[PDB]
Design a protein around this ligand. Structure first.
Ligand SMILES: Nc1ncnc2c1ncn2[C@@H]1O[C@H](COP(=O)(O)OP(=O)(O)NP(=O)(O)O)[C@@H](O)[C@H]1O
Ligand SMILES: [Mg+2]
Ligand SMILES: [Mg+2]
Lengths: 1134, 330
């Protein structure tokens, strides 16, 4: 199926089979169906069975279960086969400069140039085809490990299942989701680097004989310096993490409570608090970035020292021919590449891989759930003196029962305090230490909190079984599912989404009942099934399925209804962990009659990004100016000298382009500092904008869709982006300077370099489209794995009790294959692009080398010296450019966020009121008109329970509403919303208290005197409540003010409203959240202090609002009116 | 070792003499009864009878002379008679007397009142792991003894295993047993347990029965044949594929043991590389087993079928009743 299986050897070597996808995608949008079929070797089942067989052979062979010892005999030979070619492809690069050192002899030189070309041609084909194979091997290990971990996730016992955290598994799984696959190209350098440096040191000894350790020791100490700076960076990052946490919690708090801040008009307050929190964050980030810049610039600077120190001692004693400089420079840069970056990367990769493998090994040895010796045959299910602990505390007090084949017992008592534990013990989920519970083994459970697997209702009720027409029809009709099906969208195959949110609680109960009744079993332990249905619905279900069909076979229901126990063939009442009463129906009913009665990437995004700060353009033009000045100086000195030992020594400066074009410490720092300031400015502006968006627009944005732009985009903008763009600019600057230097020294190079740049741009633009499309497809193809994992972790109990694990295993394998197709295809196309870029560099090198040799001693030496070693910097620059293009999406999204437009006497009058949730939805009010009496309460009656929050929100103009409002003789248009909203006071159902001291939590503006605040608090009756707080008022209300009670929070909100001296108090749900003592105290306080406010109490109960003078009736699309109870109770409510 | 090797050598020496002097026509069809037909079988019939002179019940086999010639099955029964007259082990049905008549041939064998183990497996569905191990130990022991006798069973399916009063397995139906020294060639048996070597129509080695044991273990521990298909031709393709899908409730040790007993590679097949049976007998899945007690029947059986007297036929199925140069040594 996959085109890899049908491909020529040349195509497999040149990656020619990836052409058609690039051909199609660049011109049209990809469809997910266009992804190639996975190779049959990469199927999840094929790798899972192999690794599982090796792992269980390891388990049954020795008493030292090393998982790596099982991975070895699987993958070691292919690993080594690819490593050998990697070693050869590194050795050819290391030994190439020996040919250059002989080329400088000038006839014979043409053959040497051809040989120099041959080495590059061979290296182009000996490196990438092995790197791709290593990546393939990594993908295989990742797939097999994921499949094994999932296959073991359905075997743990509940004894260890509940102990682990939910997030542990997802953190472990996602920790190495991409690290393992790309963490193999650097794996072999744990033994290629030492042999490389040994060969190189020997060869340079064969040219110096006196000075070899001098440069190697310098490289070593530089390497330890670079490694040691990492701990300094890590300490600052760890310090910054907690501060990011404490800032993000407050940001999330205000994101959740946006409407409360909008009503209170607290935007500038939180602006100030957020900036104050972020200042120290910026300080720490700047320090860490400075450390990172120093570490990065050290490698770029050391390129000159590492050769100067090596050359100096031999230079002083003997004179040196120019050959032994142009050769040692190349050997030295190769050694620096080989010992400064590759080896520590390999060590880090090995350490991380070993850690992850040991973690997986530890996980695969947890306590395992054991299936009961079941499915054979059994008489009446009998339990004799079963005693076990729900965790020492025996949840079962030597219970005993025996239900004949067909009888329907009914356990009763407190929920989950012995009924659920007994049901789990019977199901075998909990092992009983004492007693022997015998059962037929076919048990179909139905948990109180039913779980609905993603898919159609038919899929959630079939459970991988046939759709028997009579059985399914009877199940639908009896369990009240026939009417639901008739009301369903497709009415037979309504494809529900994940989570079951589209279904109601009664729908979930019906689904659970259908699932329980579908399976034919000798025991149907339907536990608390009727706990979410109507009384008439419960009676219909009992007369239809529970006591009509499910009573034919053995069934043990658990209900607290008195009528339900009447039809039971046996009764076992348990309470406080002990069986208070047990026996037959009549025997237990007459055992105690008294007790029985008691029981019952565009250029626009770029230029906008730079133009946010004028200092950025200044520093960039400064850096460019110093660059062109220094390249001009180097070019003029080269021309002067090429057309006393120090005269020849100065060539070492121009020979290594790294140091000659290195970004000075006086130039790199302003760039990073300005980028950090730009990120701060952008974050502040986006926070300012998001706090003024219209509510209707905010409703279109999901709550979780805004916090991510704060928690992830800002971190990317601060940490990853600055270093990435700095590295890209430095690398591009080095490349352009070096190529200009080469071109000037020989003016015929330019005609060859121009097509090279043209082809570079063309190829990059061609590859970018497919790369980004595949990246997005892979990213969107990864959610189902975690969604299914969470769903299975929630449904584990029902899944195991039913006994349908292979269905879930096959589903997970299908999802894994679906993601693997995208990942493998993207990896292949990336390797194709890398190889093509290597080939174009190779042909450019051919051209420059031949034109140089065909046409002095310094000329050719310098040209070839830069020519051979530009390649690493060029490849690095291209990769950095692709990475910055990948990172630009965060800036694009933040800029999408920033450009969001803003929203725009006691007697009051309202008219022509029209409101809706969105722009053009259902009219909440249809020209509703009312007049506000001065200081007289107007109860909110009429359409109680139909939803009055919309009217309350529109009273403050916090929704998509239009009309005319005349409060105190002033229209709603002339008065500014900031000024108008302050006059009106509201009492939301949920009280928002800022996480901080009482003075800050109650006075965010802090514009009131402390003595006045204390006097107001004493007058509000909260002085006694505040007296129990730590200190006097500095007790920080951490965790969103969870210390205070709901009544205390309501009292604090009322006191805050009184402090603002609002002209109105639209109290809503007074007694709904208040305790009887709290409600009485609140009512007394409102009567005493808030008597002069035109309050409007909102409550569903008519009696609660009957105390108000006026009674503003409500009705669908028409606000009725009955100012007197003499007609309100007779017409409005009757 | 030591005692086991000496016992095997003594058994081989004794069996050589028995194979040297087989008997014939030890009884006539005049001292038996026709109480019930225990079962027909492949192409014959078996009826439960009692000794007229003694009173002890003995099973009697019946085979049609015309059917043997028509089916080209003459040497197999001749060799099976000698094998039964020469085999001597606790786990094999003991034959008492043989009869030869001008109409049909008869032979007297000891009766096991426990019935077929296939019915028990089908009614119960599947066994627990220790229960399956208890039978696997006996099967491995009798296969050890039979291989030490330079013979091949080649036909091991559940309905050919019986249970006695003490609860141990007695192995019957030696009709397909052949004493082969070297590579065999004859194709026969049951499609379910047809080993990959026999399916390819090649010289079967002594490891052909190892695949039968590895399939019987899976069938006893799961409840369905590990290799199943609609048609024998399709079943042949499935067996040639050699891919097995283990259930979820299988333990790791059994998952390891079954893989070696069912590997397609003849060289790496368990019980054939170097040890013969010593690898299997020392495996972790068999660690908790008293083989010395198993040989002496000193361990209580985890299952005792309900015996209701010598004449009881409750466990056995009830289905109606019944009313020259080729053979010269019967
Ligand atoms: N010694 C015995 N005691 C009790 N039942 C027996 C005995 N020998 C046979 N039977 C039963 O009689 C039935 C038929 O006899 P059997 O030995 O199986 O002939 P068969 O044709 O060669 N068997 P097969 O080829 O596998 O189909 C068997 O299914 C046994 O259950
Ligand atoms: Mg038969
Ligand atoms: Mg038989």
């Amino acid at each position: 199926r996959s085109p890899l299986e049908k491909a020529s050897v040349v195509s497999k070597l040149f990656f020619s089979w990836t052409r058609p996808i690039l051909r199609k995608g660049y011109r049209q949008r990809l469809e997910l169906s266009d992804i190639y079929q996975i190779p049959s070797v990469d199927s999840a089942d094929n790798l899972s069975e192999k690794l599982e067989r090796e792992w269980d052979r390891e388990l049954a062979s020795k008493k030292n279960p090393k998982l790596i010892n099982a991975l070895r005999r699987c993958f070691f030979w292919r690993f080594m086969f690819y490593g050998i070619f990697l070693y050869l492809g590194e050795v050819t690069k290391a030994v190439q400069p020996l040919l250059l050192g002989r080329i400088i002899a000038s006839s014979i030189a043409i053959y040497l140039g051809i040989g120099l070309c041959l080495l590059f041609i061979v290296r182009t084909l000996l490196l990438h085809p092995a790197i791709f194979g290593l990546h393939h091997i990594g993908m295989q290990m990742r797939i097999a490990m994921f499949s094994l971990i999932y296959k073991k996730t359905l075997k743990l016992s509940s004894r260890v299942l509940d102990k682990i955290s939910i997030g542990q598994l997802v953190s472990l799984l996602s920790n190495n989701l991409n690290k393992f696959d790309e963490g193999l190209a650097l794996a072999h350098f744990v033994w290629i680097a030492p042999l490389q440096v040994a060969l190189l040191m020997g060869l340079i000894w064969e040219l110096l004989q006196a000075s070899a350790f001098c440069g190697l020791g310098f490289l070593i100490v530089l390497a330890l310096f670079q490694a040691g700076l990492g701990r300094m960076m890590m300490k600052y990052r760890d310090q910054r993490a907690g501060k990011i946490s404490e800032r993000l919690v407050i940001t999330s708090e205000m994101i959740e409570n946006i409407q409360s801040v909008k009503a209170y008009c607290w935007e500038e307050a939180m602006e100030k608090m957020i900036e104050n929190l972020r200042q120290t964050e910026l300080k720490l980030t700047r320090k860490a970035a400075y450390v990172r810049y120093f570490n990065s610039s050290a490698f770029f600077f050391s390129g000159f020292f590492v050769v100067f120190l090596s050359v100096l001692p031999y230079a002083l004693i003997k004179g040196i021919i120019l050959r032994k400089i142009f050769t040692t420079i190349s050997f030295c840069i190769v050694l620096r590449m080989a010992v400064t970056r590759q080896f520590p990367w390999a060590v880090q990769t090995w350490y991380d891989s070993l850690g992850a493998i040991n973690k997986i090994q530890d996980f695969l040895q947890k306590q395992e759930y054991k299936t009961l010796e079941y499915n054979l045959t059994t008489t009446e299910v009998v339990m004799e003196n079963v005693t076990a602990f729900w965790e020492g505390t025996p949840v079962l007090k030597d219970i005993n029962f025996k239900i004949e084949r067909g009888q329907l017992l009914a356990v009763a008592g407190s929920t989950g305090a012995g009924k659920t534990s007994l049901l789990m013990v019977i199901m075998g989920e909990l092992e009983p230490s004492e007693g022997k519970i015998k059962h037929s083994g076919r048990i179909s459970f139905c948990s109180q909190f039913s779980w609905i697997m993603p898919g159609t209702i038919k899929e959630n009720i079939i459970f991988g079984v046939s759709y028997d027409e009579y059985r399914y029809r009877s199940v639908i009709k009896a369990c009240q599912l026939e009417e639901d099906i008739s009301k369903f969208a497709e009415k037979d195959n309504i494809v529900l989404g994940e989570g079951g949110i589209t279904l109601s609680g009664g729908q979930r109960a019906r689904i659970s009942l259908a699932r329980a009744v579908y399976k034919d079993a000798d025991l149907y332990l339907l536990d608390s099934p009727f706990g979410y249905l109507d009384v008439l619905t419960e009676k219909e279900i009992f007369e239809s399925c529970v006591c009509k069909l499910m009573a034919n076979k053995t069934r043990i229901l658990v209900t607290s209804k008195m009528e339900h126990l009447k039809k039971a063939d046996k009764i076992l009442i348990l309470h406080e962990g002990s069986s208070y009463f047990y026996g037959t129906f009549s025997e237990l009913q007459n055992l105690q009659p008294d007790f029985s009665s008691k029981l019952m990437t565009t250029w626009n995004t770029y230029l906008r990004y730079i133009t946010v700060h004028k200092s950025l353009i200044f520093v960039l033009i400064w850096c460019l100016v110093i660059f062109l000045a220094e390249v001009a100086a180097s070019l003029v000195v080269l021309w002067l000298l090429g057309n006393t030992s120090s005269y020849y020594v100065f060539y070492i400066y121009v020979g290594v382009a790294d140091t000659l074009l290195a970004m000075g410490f006086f130039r790199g720092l302003p760039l990073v500092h300005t980028l950090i300031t730009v990120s701060k400015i952008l974050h502040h502006k986006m926070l300012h904008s998001v706090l003024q968006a219209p509510m209707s627009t905010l409703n279109t944005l999901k709550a979780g869709g805004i916090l991510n732009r704060f928690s992830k985009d800002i971190a990317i903008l601060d940490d990853l982006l600055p270093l990435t763009i700095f590295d890209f600019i430095q690398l591009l600057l080095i490349v352009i300077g070096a190529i200009a230097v080469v071109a000037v020294l020989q003016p015929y190079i330019f005609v060859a370099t121009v097509p090279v740049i043209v082809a570079f741009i063309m190829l990059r633009a061609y590859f970018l489209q497919t790369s980004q499309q595949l990246k997005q497809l892979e990213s969107e193809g990864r959610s189902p794995i975690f969604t299914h994992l969470v769903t299975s972790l929630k449904g584990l109990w029902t899944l195991r009790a039913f006994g349908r694990q292979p269905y879930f295993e096959t589903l997970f394998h299908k999802a894994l294959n679906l993601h693997t197709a995208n990942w493998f295809l993207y990896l292949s196309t990336l390797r194709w692009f890398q190889m093509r870029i290597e080939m174009i560099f190779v042909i450019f090198f051919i051209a420059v080398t031949f034109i140089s040799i065909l046409t002095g001693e310094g000329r050719v030496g310098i040209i070839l010296t830069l020519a051979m070693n530009i390649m690493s910097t060029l490849q690095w620059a291209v990769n950095s450019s692709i990475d910055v293009d990948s990172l630009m999406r965060s800036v694009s999204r933040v800029f999408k966020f920033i450009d969001m437009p803003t929203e725009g006497g006691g007697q009051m009058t309202v008219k022509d009121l029209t409101a809706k949730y969105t722009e053009g939805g259902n009219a909440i009010l249809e020209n509703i008109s009312f007049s506000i009496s001065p200081g007289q309460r107007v109860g909110l009656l009429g359409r109680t329970g139909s939803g009055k929050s919309t009217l309350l929100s529109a009273f403050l103009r916090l929704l998509n509403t239009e009309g005319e409002i005349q409060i105190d003789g002033v229209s709603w248009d002339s008065i500014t919303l900031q000024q108008w909203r302050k006059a009106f006071g509201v009492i939301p159902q949920k009280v928002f208290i800022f996480s901080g001291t009482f003075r800050k939590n109650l006075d965010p503006y802090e514009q009131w005197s402390d003595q006045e605040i204390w006097k107001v608090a004493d007058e509000v009756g909260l002085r006694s409540v505040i007296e129990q707080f730590p200190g006097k008022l500095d007790f920080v209300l951490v965790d969103g003010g969870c210390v205070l009670s709901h009544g205390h929070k309501q009292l604090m909100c009322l006191a805050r409203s009184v402090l603002s001296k609002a002209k109105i108090l639209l109290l809503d749900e007074p007694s709904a959240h208040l305790d009887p003592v709290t409600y009485q105290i609140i009512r007394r306080t409102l009567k005493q202090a808030f008597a002069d406010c035109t309050v409007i109490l909102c409550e569903h109960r008519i009696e609660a609002m009957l105390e108000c003078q006026q009674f503003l009736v409500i009705e669908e699309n028409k606000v009725r009116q009955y100012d007197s109870i003499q007609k309100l109770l007779n017409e409005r409510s009757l | 070792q030591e005692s086991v090797k000496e016992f095997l050598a003594k058994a081989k020496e004794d069996f050589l003499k028995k194979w040297e002097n087989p008997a014939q026509n030890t009884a006539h069809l005049d001292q038996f009864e026709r109480i019930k037909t225990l079962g027909t079988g492949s192409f014959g019939r078996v009826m439960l009878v009692k000794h007229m002179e003694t009173g002890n019940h003995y099973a009697m086999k019946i085979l049609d002379k015309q059917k043997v010639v028509k089916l080209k099955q003459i040497e197999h029964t001749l060799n099976e008679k000698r094998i039964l007259q020469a085999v001597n082990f606790p786990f094999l049905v003991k034959l008492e007397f043989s009869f030869k008549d001008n109409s049909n041939l008869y032979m007297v064998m000891e009766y096991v009142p426990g019935g077929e183990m296939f019915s028990h497996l089908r009614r119960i569905g599947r066994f627990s792991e220790p229960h399956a191990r208890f039978y696997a130990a006996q099967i491995v022991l009798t296969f050890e003894y039979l291989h030490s006798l330079d013979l091949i069973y080649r036909d091991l399916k559940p309905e050919n295993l019986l249970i006695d009063q003490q609860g141990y397995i007695q192995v019957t139906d030696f009709g397909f047993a052949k004493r082969v020294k070297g590579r065999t060639w004859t194709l026969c048996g049951t499609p379910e347990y047809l080993a990959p070597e026999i399916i390819l129509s090649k010289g079967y080695n002594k490891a052909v029965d190892w695949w039968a044991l590895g399939v019987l273990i899976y069938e006893m521990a799961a409840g369905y044949p590990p290799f199943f298909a609609d048609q024998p031709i399709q079943i042949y393709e499935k067996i040639v594929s050699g891919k097995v899908r283990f259930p979820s409730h299988f333990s790791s040790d059994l998952k390891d043991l079954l893989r070696n007993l069912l590997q397609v590679d003849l060289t790496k097949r368990f019980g054939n590389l170097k040890n013969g049976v010593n690898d299997i007998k020392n495996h972790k899945w068999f660690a908790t087993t008293d083989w010395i007690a198993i040989y002496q029947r000193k361990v209580e059986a985890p299952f005792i079928p309900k015996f209701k007297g010598p004449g009881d036929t409750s466990n056995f199925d009830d289905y109606e009743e019944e009313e020259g140069k080729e053979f010269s040594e019967f």
